[PDB]
Structures are given as structure tokens and as C-alpha cells.
Amino acid sequence: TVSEAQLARRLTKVKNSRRMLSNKPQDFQIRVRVIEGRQLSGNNIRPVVKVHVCGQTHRTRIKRGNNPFFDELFFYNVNMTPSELMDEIISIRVYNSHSLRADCLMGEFKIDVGFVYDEPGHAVMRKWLLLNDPEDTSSGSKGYMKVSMFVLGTGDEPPPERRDRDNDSDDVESNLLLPAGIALRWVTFLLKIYRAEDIPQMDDAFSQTVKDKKNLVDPFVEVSFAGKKVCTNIIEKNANPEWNQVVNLQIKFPSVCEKIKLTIYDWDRLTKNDVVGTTYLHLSKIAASVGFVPTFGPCYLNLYGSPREYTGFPDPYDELNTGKGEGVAYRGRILVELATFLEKTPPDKKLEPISNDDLLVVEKYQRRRKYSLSAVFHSATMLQDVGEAIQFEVSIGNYGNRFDTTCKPLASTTQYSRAVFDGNYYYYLPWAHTKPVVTLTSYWEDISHRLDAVNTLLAMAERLQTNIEALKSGIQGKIPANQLAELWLKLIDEVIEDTRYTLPLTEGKANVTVLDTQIRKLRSRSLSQIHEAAVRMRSEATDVKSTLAEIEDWLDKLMQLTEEPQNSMPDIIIWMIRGEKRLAYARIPAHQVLYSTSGENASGKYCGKTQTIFLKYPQEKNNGPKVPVELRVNIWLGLSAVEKKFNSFAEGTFTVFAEMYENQALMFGKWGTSGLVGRHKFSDVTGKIKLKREFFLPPKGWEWEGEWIVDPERSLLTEADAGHTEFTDEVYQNESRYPGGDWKPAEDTYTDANGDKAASPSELTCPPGWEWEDDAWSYDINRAVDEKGWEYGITIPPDHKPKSWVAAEKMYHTHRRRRLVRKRKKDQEGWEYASLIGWKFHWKQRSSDTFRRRRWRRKMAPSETHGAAAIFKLETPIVSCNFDRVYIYHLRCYVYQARNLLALDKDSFSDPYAHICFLHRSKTTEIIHSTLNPTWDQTIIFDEVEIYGEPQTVLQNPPKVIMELFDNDQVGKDEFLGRSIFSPVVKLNSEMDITPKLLWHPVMNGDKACGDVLVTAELILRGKDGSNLPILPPQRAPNLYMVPQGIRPVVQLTAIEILAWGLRNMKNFQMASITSPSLVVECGGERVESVVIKNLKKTPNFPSSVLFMKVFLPKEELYMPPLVIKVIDHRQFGRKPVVGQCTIERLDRFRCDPYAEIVDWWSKFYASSGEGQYIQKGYSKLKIYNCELENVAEFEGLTDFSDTFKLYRGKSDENEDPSVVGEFKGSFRIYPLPDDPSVPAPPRQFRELPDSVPQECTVRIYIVRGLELQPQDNNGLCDPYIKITLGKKVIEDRDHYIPNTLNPVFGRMYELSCYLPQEKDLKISVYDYDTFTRDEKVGETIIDLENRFLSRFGSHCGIPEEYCVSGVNTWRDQLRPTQLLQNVARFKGFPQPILSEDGSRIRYGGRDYSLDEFEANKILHQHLGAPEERLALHILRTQGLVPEHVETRTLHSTFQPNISQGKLQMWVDVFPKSLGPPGPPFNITPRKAKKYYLRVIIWNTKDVILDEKSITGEEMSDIYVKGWVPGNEENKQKTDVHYRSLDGEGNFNWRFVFPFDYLPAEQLCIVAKKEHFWSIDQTEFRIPPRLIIQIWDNDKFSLDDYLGFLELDLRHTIIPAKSPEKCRLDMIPDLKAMNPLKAKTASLFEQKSMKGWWPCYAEKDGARVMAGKVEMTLEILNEKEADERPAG
């Protein structure tokens, strides 16, 4: 059907439109203007409009008649998510009003904000609504509503209006917003909700203790759709509920909602209903357009949110349960199905039970399959502190949850491991050759028919993404065209070979839905389109630069083919548990590690492969200052029926040890078996359970390897501290006190992380082969400690020792700790001993130990009949993967430089250094002081890094190199600048030894990039010796390597010219003005300093404006270092502080080749805008700009002379830009110099500079009108006036404000005398006057008047089209057009303009210009000046200068920081007094409304409907006529009553006189009166001129009885018939009762008088009926003709 197709097309349109960022706050402004209703229902109505957007409701004032004119603009300022805003509904609703009753509904249109967002420009324009009644919907239309509504986001602008004389004001089907094919259709979504599983405990569990712990939740589903909330039934005490309820969602098709929000709630009787979790159906993702309606399911949707552990206290992460944030734990899953049923709109049973045959259908989507998951933990590095022991728990869904103690021991977690210092900064878990192994078994639906397709399309997209990265690197590197064509042919053949992939056959699979068939059909269509376009492109196209736009479109289409809403597999969540508490999480999608039998590509990207994931703290959007751990893990997921295929993915030998414990005790100096009381001699690890050596047997698939052996060597075998060559030791020191007492040395005055006392620093000695770097130890300052290096903690019972520390001392603290460091360069009888049995045994006996024990362990090896797959058959054993050999590597990181770093000191700079970390190794770069753009120029070498696994597995997945940038501070702790994560270039042999390429990787702090760092790395597999490694880089300091020659950017000699023009807006520094500044420009280690300004207040510009330095700069434009600008204020006692700095990193713009009817102003304005025309008299126009003059792209922002860079000072807070303390005005020209001085230098680029002295300027600000201001009063209007600040002078106009309009017509010139450039900042503000209260600011704009003065485009005065010396268009510039042509010839280096002997030709710019080339086809009226100036001006108009313009300047405000608060049509002329006085100013004073008189006479009435009963008691009518103009309610007049009419006929011969003010140029009238009696100032209305004539039954002693009306718009008055018998209905338009026809119209203002018969009407049951006929003559006279022939 066409309805299903158009729903699919509209949902794909909203699919393409919904692509912006999901910022939960975002500032939006929605304007809704109603203009004019046409043909509203009822008779003698008093209509009114109420518009409801986002809860806010505005209200029009009361108008009259069946064709009301409102022209009222409403504003809606909301702050919400864009996706939530575009699901909101705008509800326009027309009411009738009464004098003694409330409002009655008469029409309603509903339209969502999303579709008016999808319109180009985010704003529908003067479109007509089809009003309909929600309960009287069978009657069709009720009226029409011309509205225009706008949506403005951050940076968005409304589109300009267009001319409306004949296209928009008439006929309404020419501008319908929606066509008639919609036919008020409803769309019904049957969101069936079957059941849910694994809902966590959300009740108190104390009631069941008194009286079952698995089912402590009372769930129900909240379905939010289009603002309506439908709640399902509540299932009491069931964690696996079964609702089985269809939710009958409904939307009328003009207003659709896209985001169905399902939110399971735990119902609480006494408290608020808690949130279980929130998932969404996106209707645009489950619908397409051939196409199909929204279909989904039956498929489980997984919920995510807070951790599942119940706390009676408020949990800190309930914001994750509401769908905000990504969610850190599995909260259950809900089985839903979506079906779309067009029409049939059933209002009964919004909740309907599931029919009993759908419960048989849904059984086949509920079948479970066994899944086996393995995870081999390779390396857990970048740990910030050791703390307690650290454990990793793997869980998919609720399977493998360690805190679910009600189940059996799951063995889904690693052993507790204690972190080891890597020698420089970080910590790592010491796994080495024995990686931990986690295995767990889950049960999910076999949805491989989805996930093979998802994984294969993802592999397609990743291959094509790699190929387009190769292509963009090829075209960026300027590699030769043959290799580029070969690489492009490789790309196209990759597409051809890939997209002949047949998607998996849905027939035969159990869990195939209707949506699965539709997505498979869509994917086959898309893949066939991509394959055939590839076979077209491989033979047709020849150029790759045209085709990358199509190839990126293929990448976009392929990445939209991987969208799978029916992914029922929950994510694998890996939790780091420090101590007993959850710390950090990561979510791996289950399809990324899932194994399929269909091949490699159908398996996941990381299926059986080691991937690097960074854990996050549970409510962080990204990593902040502290990454908790960087974890490399080898995850393989798959079906347990094919778990034998894990053998091909496994590496190493999996190993589980059976264990036994034997205990002994010491009496009389001899160890023996005596005294083993309370714990068994042969027992477990705790000693409570008696065990034997014969109690352990291998399970199925396992066999013994070797014999039982003693295992005491696990202390020595943990990596032997041999992987480092430069180290830093650490020894901790402790003190203790009572609360409130004095400090003293502790019971354990030196400790380590294990929890007991350690050796003093005087006892520490080096290992053999090592020596000390420093002579003595020192205490740590660079942590969260005080001045002496101490942190403080507390002991709380029942714990005896502290577990946390803070930076400051409080009175309740009982302990303290200090770290001591020093750099470094270059017994075992088989038992562990302790003081008690079952105590803390340690490998060496102390004086207090009288007990001992040992381990008796035997190895199990997997059998050959099972392979490594036997680890899944362990249904506790602890599995660990042993690697039989190690591979030695060698990493070199070329940290070259950084740019645009954050300022984190008070002296406006930083001291950045970098921690380079890679696995269990770390090193620190040098500290570069007092800069934000450091050049470390340093190579960081980690020789002999031990990486386990095959070298190919390192090649496919390199471990990440992580750089953390820190601002060094001499006191306090060093602050975090950002973090860059990148992959090294792995090399395994001498073939792949190509040199690495430096790249600008981003430096992410939080969620934003806070600079870029130029860094690369290479990771070389070390051979038999270090001979295969390249040579060491040359040192410049001891153990300080430079970046080598092949990696370093190749530098050339390059000039940088700096046009230091001047400094603007210099804010005070240290409560002193910037009196003697200077400029310092640093680039590439060289600096240049300008001359010192002796007084900034006197001279704001540098005395010599050109600086010059020779710098070595990279040849490649990518590698170009930033340009640093500082401002140094020179003060007393020789002090030179820095008072401002900017970083300019985009220098590609700076590189250049050095060898390269009444006549006034408003008639002109209305002729240019388009609102006896003015162009017929031959006069000129002006150029109306819809934006600012700086925002016009042709004038380059009016910064062609010099750009402007904001200067910043001090430490920046919340990672944004720092405080702006001014602006440096200048520009740069960068060009490569010749290498040797025999070649002459290139010419300088700054020669034609103007004079930098201050100049006095006469500035004329002509402000024309304001457009759509923000309302600042209670009535929705504003009383605007103009407040101009220009340096010191303020001209406010509060006594000449314009009363109560949102579209003011100012028409006022404000002339000032200011000194440029000290007063360059021209601030024009519109302010709302108030009678008693404070004045609000509507808006604000800034014009750089020096940019107007100094630009080459002549923006100081716009050149008009004609040179007139008199009239209203007199030449307002100071200089004649010959002098402007002289000036532009002098600027451009052209020869000066040569005037001929008669002024007909001018030689300029190498061309001949003549008078007859421009003066032809024009009327040369009398105001034209000298013809040589006309021809010079005609030359000047073609030179790209600023024309005579009215720019539209956006009024910005702090109410909404980048949303237009209105617009201000205006222009500014700057007239510098050195060039002479200007001409006469333009009189832009708005024209008065010229008076008009409307006169009618009423001849007769015929076939009027007779009144049914008069007062006298007869079928008898008292016919008489009222008449008025809308707006003029006070000017109502009525005729005499034609008494005793028994035939519907009546003669009046009565005269009406209707004075009204008119604007012929705007084609509308002015009526002025107060809104009410207590109005401060009278208001003005702008409504089109029209006449309401009305016919009435008198009833002199009774009520007035309405009979009919007739409306004649005086510009479009319909042509009357010449007789009452030819007069009939439907010669006037009608759009509701019958299929419409065009009428015949004539203007009464032009055709001044005509006489005839007119039809008048009323309506009943929505259909027009004739109330009668009336004869009249309508005439319009002006003011003087009303006095020439007056009338009564």
C-alpha cells in the first residue's frame, strides 16, 4: 500500500536526519508564528489560537470573523536533548471565546518538532494547516491555519522570508504543509511484551527474614511513546515475570515519535518505584524503504545500569538505570515483539492480553543453547597504586556473577594478584609466563544467523576502512600515480570479492523473525547494489579523487548494514575487584568474540585474539586523570557443541594443579608432627577440612602430567626482577598516634604492601650487577601529600589497620604514611613458616614462628583426545595458561613535540612532560618548562620487553603505547594534561624495517581533545642478539636520545613575517594597566621580539609593524609546529611578566608564494527587499544581506588586512579555554627561504601598510529595523530602544523607545566621534524599556570598526549603484568615486586611473571602460552627477567592494549563548576625518501611514432568510446591516432597520464612513489603540485591509439575532455580479464543503469604485448556506479626495 510506503519513507527520512550528538543538555529555541486563519467553522465566532510546545502554552488575543488575522510570534526556550526535543509535539489549537462562558474547542493540529527539523533550514515557511477536531474527526476539516514555525539549535539560523504577493497569500493548496493523501490516518504499534528474565533484587529482604531471596522484585514495564506512559501489570515477587500484554501504542500520522522507551520498574508500596533498567526501540532502525513497516522481535533486549548488589542506602548509580550513561552491569532482559498495523485505531483496551496462539509462536524464540566462554588474562598494567589485591571477574549476563552467593561456586574469576612497581611510575600485575584463565558456561538463544552477517559486514567495513586509510595516506604522501591506481584497483577488487558474499540462509534456523527476513532482503539488495556499482566503477572510472566520495558512501552504507537491533546476546562485562569491592568495568560486545563455523569473517574481530581494553570507573563517559587498569585479554566465546574448535584458537598449555597441604610444628628445636590441634595435619588451605593425597583424581578429558612435587619456589619464580635496567625502589614509613594525641613512630615504622613490617632503607642493598644513582634516599613530594610527604588515615573497628589515605591531617586520624625513593642503575627448606597453624605463612622463618607448612602439588595436563578444550569440562579448580617460551622485543617511541596543551600554572603556561608506558615498562621524558607547545625531541627506548604469545599475534594486535602528559609543579602534585593512546609499528624481520611515520595523535582530557602530540613508535622483535636492531640515536645529554634523522621532520630554512599591528582590549594584570607591552613570537625554538610600546593608551599600535625571523620548519605541511605568541609587559624594577598568550596551530592559511510612490530611502529598501514600482523611475537598489557583513564569505570576514587572535591568561578550569585578556591583531606570511645567501632573498610581504597612528572618525550608525526579537515582557512583547556603547561614549535612547512590538522600525541614525582603534569595539544593544522595573537586554552585537576602516573592500562606506548629487540618494561618502578608484589603484599596484578629455573613458587596471557600457538601457534622471564619477563608480562596483548594504546582524545574549535572540537590519559608515567631512546623511526616518477613507452605501437586500419568530409573534424579519473594518471595533456603524419585511427584501440607502490608516508599500493597514485600559503605551497592529459586512435581525425589545456575513479583502475584492438573479453561491471561494474553484478578483485601491450584487452566507453542519444577497458600492478615496467631494 502507499500508506505503508510513505510511513517507511518518513521513517527513513528521520533515520537520516537523526545523526547529531546526543548531548543531554542542549539549548534550543522554537518560534511558532500564527499568521492568518482561513474559513474557520462556526458562525459569529470570536477565534483565538493557543500553541503548546514542551509544556509551555502561549495565547493569542481575541480576533473576529471566520477569516481572522493574528500575526503573532511566540517564543519557546527549552534546554533538553536533541533526540528528546525532536520527539516532542507542537500542539496548535484554535478555540472560540465567549463574553460569559469559557473557551470551546473548534480546531486542532498536532505536529512533532522532528519533521520541522527535517525541513531544509529547520523551519517550515508560511505553510497552511489542515485543522481537524479530535472527537468530531468524521466531519473532515474544521478550518485552516497559516502558520510559520522555526527551530534554532546551536549555531543554527532561520531561513529568510520570501515575497508573498501572489504565491503565499492565496488559495492555500499552493502552500499546504501536508498533502491530502494523508487522510487523517492513524498508525498503531502493537508492542507485545511477553516476559523478562534475571531482574535483580530491589526489595528490603528483611520481611522475608521475618517470614525466597531470589525473587525480591515486583516488576512492571513503563512504555513511553510520544509523551504517553502506559504501565503494564505488576507481578508480585518474581524476578522472572511473565506479563504477556500487548501495548497498543497510537500516533496520528502527522505527528510521529521515533524512540519507544521501555523502563522496568520495581513497584514499591511505601516508597518511590525504583528503576531496574531502560532499553529502547528505535523505530527508524527497524524500518526501511521494497520497504517495510516497523517490525521487531520476538527477541530479548538487554538492560544495563547500576551494579546488581542491593543496598538499602541510595545507590550512587541510579542515573545509569534511567538510560543515561552506558550502564555497567547486566540488569536483566525483556522479551518484546513489535508489529505495525496501519489504521484500525482501537481506543478500547490500551492494555490487551496476548492471544493464546502467540504464546505458541513465541516458544520457538525462547530455545536456549549452551555457550562456553574462555578468557586468558595476558597483562594488567598502568595500575596507579598497589592497594589491596586485585582480581578480575568475567560475566556475560548473570552467568559468572561472583557476588551471587546463592549459586554454586562458578570459578569465573582470577586469583588475587598484588601489583608490582615497574620501576618508573606505574604498577602491573606480575603474570609473566603463567596467565590466569577464566572459564564460564552460559545459555543464550542461538542467534548466529544475525551475528555471522553482522561480523562479516563488519569485517567488510574494516577491510574497506583500512583500504581507504591507505588511499588517503597515498594521496597525502603524493605517491606516484601508478601505485595509487594499483592500490585503488586493490580496493575495488576487495569490494568485488567481498560483496558477492551470500548472507546466511534464514530457512532452517529456529530463531528467524519477520525482521530477520526483512533485514536479509535489505542486506542482499544493498550488497547487490554495492557489487554492481563496483563492477561498474572498475571498468568505467579512471580517476580516484572523484570516486573516494562514493567509496566513503559505501563505507557508510556497510556500517549501516551492521546495525542489528535484535542482538539478544548480552555483553561480556569484566570487573576489576580491588579488595572485596567493585572498582572498574569494561563491556565487550558478545559478537566481537563469538565463534562461528562459517569461517574467520563470520567470527568476531577479536574471537580468540588478544584485545586491549581500558577499564572505566562506573560513571565516567571516558577515561579521566586516572585509568584504573589497561587490560589485555584473550576472549573466545562460542557454542559448547563446537567447543573443540577452541583448540585452533588456543596458545600455550592449559594447566590446573591439584593441591594438598601438610602442616608441622616446632618444639624443643626440632620440627615434628606434635601440637597439630584444631587444624588437620593433611588438610586444605584453611586447615578445617581433612584431605588426603589420594582424594584428587583428574576429571573427564584430563590426565596427570608428572608426579606430585613440592612447590615452594613460587616466590622466586615471579619474574626475578630481571626485566628492567633502570629502576627506582620504594620503601614506606609509618607513624601512629591516638586520636587527638601527638605523633610517634609506629608499631611497624617501615612497611610494604603485603601488610607486615619491612626492612629499613639503611638495610637495603643493590642486587648483583646494580649500583645506586643517588647517594641517599629522599622522600616523595609528587603525590597527594602535604609539605613533608605524609598522607593520613584512620582505623575503624573491627579493622586494626588502615586501608585509605587523604592529603590532609584531621583530628580523628590515627596513622600516617610516607613514600621514600631512590633511583637504581644497571630459609628455603621447602617450607613456609608462621607463628600459628593456618596463619600467614611466609618463606623465611622469624623469631616468633613455631609452625610451618608446605604445598604438595601435582600438574594436570589436558588429554590428546580433547586438546585445550578440556577446560570447559570442569563442571575449585584454578586454570592457568603456561607459555613454553618467551619472545623478546624492543620498543622505540619518538616523542617529538606537542601542541595546544592546557595551561595549568598561574603564569599562563605549563611544564609538560610525558609518561611513556607500554606493558610492564615505563619511562619519563624530560620536562620542558614554561611552554604549552613543548619540543621534547626525545626517543624513549624500552629494550628487552617480554611479550608472550606468537609474534604474529603481536603483529595483528599490538599492545597499546599510552602517553600521559603532566604539567610539572615544583610544589603540590603534578596536574593532568591529557592522554594519547596509539599503536606501535610491529616488525618481525628485516623485510618490514620501513621507517615509522610521525602522526599527530590527539591528547584526550575527559571527552575533548586538549591538544595533539606528534608521536610514533616501532616494536621490533629482537633476534638472537641485538644485532638486528637499528643503531642507537645520537645523544645530546646522558641517557637522552634525540629523534633520529629518518623519523624527524626534514627541516628547511623558512621565513616567518609577523605583522604586529597592535593590541586590543588589554585587561589589567596584577591590578595594573598594560602600559608598556611588547610582542614575542616563538616558533621552532627561535623567537623574535617587537619594539616596546612606550604607552598603550597613547599609541595602541606597535611603532614598527613588521617583524622577521629565520626558522627551520618542516617541509611536510602536516609536521608544522604551532606559532606561539606572548605579550610581555615591561614594568618597574626590570620586571617583565607575561600578560597574554595564544597558540595558533593552523598555519596553512598563512603560507604564501612570495613571488605571486513617494521617493525616499524606504522606497529603495522596499524595492530591494521585494515587499507604479520604484524601479520604473530608474532609481537604484541596495544589497540586503541575510547575515552580518563579516559573515559574508566574499569579504573574507573583513580581516584581509590582519586577522585577530584572542589572548589568554592564567590556569584554565574545566579543560576549556582560559580567560580572554585581550586580542592581538595581526597576520603572518610564511614562505621558504633559499638555502645559501648567494640567491637573493624573496620580497617582503608587508609594504603597503597604512599609518598606525590613531585617527578620529565620524561613525554614522543607521539602524533600520529589528526582526523577531526575544519577548521580554509579560504580554509576550518588547518596548525596544537602542543603547550604543563605543569605547567611553554611551548613547542610549530610552526616551525614544518604540512601544510594544517584536518587529520595531527604528529608522534612526546615531552619529558619534570616536578614536580608532582605541574605541574599535562598537557594541549595539537592543534593550527592553520597562515603566517601573529593570530593563532587560534583548540582544547585543559587536562591529570591529577598525576592520571596517582598514579592509581593502571599502567597508567604511558601501558604494551605491548610481552617483547622485541631490535628492534622497545623495552621495554620502567623503570621497568622490574617482578618489576611491584612485585609492584602489594605489593599493593594488595598478597604474593610476587616467581620465579622458571628455570624461567618457578611464584607463584602469589594464582595461578600457566606457560610458556606453553601463549607461545604456537606463533612465538618466536629473539627480545624476558628473559622468566621470558615474563611470568610476561603475568600475568600482565590479571590483568586489562592499555595496550600499543593509546587513542583518544577529543579536546574541547570555540568556542563550549561541542562539539568535533576534536580528537587527542596519549598517555602519565609518568616516575618518583625515579624508575630509562626509556628505549628507540618509534620512531613514520611517514613513507615516497615509490616510484613506472607505465609503460604502447599502442599496438593497434580496432573498434574505426570514426570521422564524419576532417579538410580535409572526414569521417576520427585521433586516438591518452592520458594517466595520477588522481592528476597528470602535468604528462599528449600523444602518436603519427595514421594518415589516415579509419577503426577505429591504431598502436602506444608508451611508458608511470608515477612516483607516494605510501603508501602500507593505500592502497592509495600521490600526492603533491600547490593548487594555491599564496599558502603558498604545500598541500598533499590522493587518491587511478588509471589510466585514454583516446582516442582522433587529428584535428591538429582545436580543440581537445573527444571520450572516460577507468579507471583502480590499486588495482582493471578488468581482460582483450585475444582477441579483445572476448572483449565487460558490463564486466566492470555499475549501471545505465541496471541491474548490478559483475566483475572480480585482483591487479596490487601483480600480477605485465598482457597483454590483454580492452573496452573503452562514454555515451549518460544516457546509455553507446562503444567508441572502446584498447590493452595495465600494469605493476607496485618499485624504484630499475626501475633502474634494465630502459625504455624510
Ligand SMILES: CCCCCC(=O)OC[C@H](COP(=O)(O)OC[C@H](N)C(=O)O)OC(=O)CCCCC
Ligand atoms: C520492617 C521493614 C520496614 C520497611 C519500610 C520501607 O519501606 O523501607 C524502605 C527502605 C528501602 O526499600 P526499597 O525497596 O525502596 O529500597 C530500594 C533501594 N533504595 C534501591 O534504590 O535499590 O527499606 C530499608 O531501607 C530497609 C529497612 C529495614 C528495617 C528493619
Ligand SMILES: CCCCCC(=O)OC[C@H](COP(=O)(O)OC[C@H](N)C(=O)O)OC(=O)CCCCC
Ligand atoms: C505588578 C507588576 C510587577 C512587575 C512584574 C511584571 O509582570 O511586570 C510587567 C512589566 C514588564 O514585565 P517585567 O519585565 O517586569 O517582567 C518580565 C520578566 N522580567 C521576564 O524577563 O520575563 O513591568 C513593569 O514595570 C510594568 C508594570 C505595570 C503595572 C501596571
Ligand SMILES: [Ca+2]
Ligand atoms: Ca524497592
Ligand SMILES: [Ca+2]
Ligand atoms: Ca518492590
Ligand SMILES: [Ca+2]
Ligand atoms: Ca523505593
Ligand SMILES: [Ca+2]
Ligand atoms: Ca600547575
Ligand SMILES: [Ca+2]
Ligand atoms: Ca607548573
Ligand SMILES: [Ca+2]
Ligand atoms: Ca520587561
Ligand SMILES: [Ca+2]
Ligand atoms: Ca517592557
Ligand SMILES: [Ca+2]
Ligand atoms: Ca523588567
Ligand SMILES: [Ca+2]
Ligand atoms: Ca425578528
Ligand SMILES: [Ca+2]
Ligand atoms: Ca429573531
